[PDB]
Design a protein around this ligand. Sequence first.
Ligand code: ZN
Ligand code: ZN
Ligand code: ZN
Length: 75
Amino acid sequence: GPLGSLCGRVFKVGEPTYSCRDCAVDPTCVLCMECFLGSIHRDHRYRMTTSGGGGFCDCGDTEAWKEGPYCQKHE
Ligand SMILES: [Zn+2]
Ligand SMILES: [Zn+2]
Ligand SMILES: [Zn+2]
């Protein structure tokens, strides 16, 4: 997987991405669905944006999230 990423996911065409409006630096900070659903951000105000192809999951990037950087799979 991409060097420097804990999750490793690169988004498929049509695959949902999740940015937490309450915690993300900006809308480019995203989680894949499995990371999002196992994260504290599932209860926050969020944005589901479908990837057009490409981009990558930011799970475990402690600079991307004001709180809750690791989902349960990546704890
Ligand atoms: Zn992920
Ligand atoms: Zn994760
Ligand atoms: Zn959040």
